[PDB]
RNA sequence: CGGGUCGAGCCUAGGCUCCGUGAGGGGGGAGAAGUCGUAACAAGGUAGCCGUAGGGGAACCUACGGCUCGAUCACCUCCU
Ligand SMILES: [Mg+2]
């Protein structure tokens with residue numbers, strides 16, 4: 001079929017509202033809480049993360065409130081390709 | 096029982112000091128995929144810096160008197 005990072009293991013999905021900066025990414029997840037993410041040492045070179053962008057993140061189990069870690073960003077090729085299959089519906093990005 | 100005298104302890108009021116919490120405030124140090132400019136370094140595009148005073152979102156701008164730890168050309172002056 002295809003190779004995409006689905007929710008496999010303990011991943012999350014991350015769509016930020018506004019970046020406070022300095023690494024911390026502020027995401028409006030549908031988990032319920034306001035979450036704040038940080039970046040590992042491999043992806044601060046080739047890519048670009050902005051508000052209006054959907055990515056997959058990975059949390060740590062602490063406090064289930066403010067978690068997340070960037071492990072993969074989504075391209076203009078797959079962001080809306082993950083729509084018809086309904087793995088995410090876009091009613092949680094503007095309303 | 097009376098007389099004198101040594102006395103720790105206790106109370107009240109006044110002068111100083113120590114310590115755990117502290118509404119509100121102020122700078123300091125690490126973090127650098129947040130923001131606004133370009134002040135320094137070449138004559139860094141207005142030469143840079145010291146003292147004192149006024150001004151400005153912020154680096155900073157201006158006035159008077161000093162220094163060279165200032166670049167280029169032309170003419171002098173003083174030497175080797
Ligand atoms: Mg400058």
Ligand SMILES: [Mg+2]
Nearest residue numbers: 139140141142
């Ligand atoms: Mg200048």
Ligand SMILES: [Mg+2]
Nearest residue numbers: 145160161162
């Ligand atoms: Mg003098």
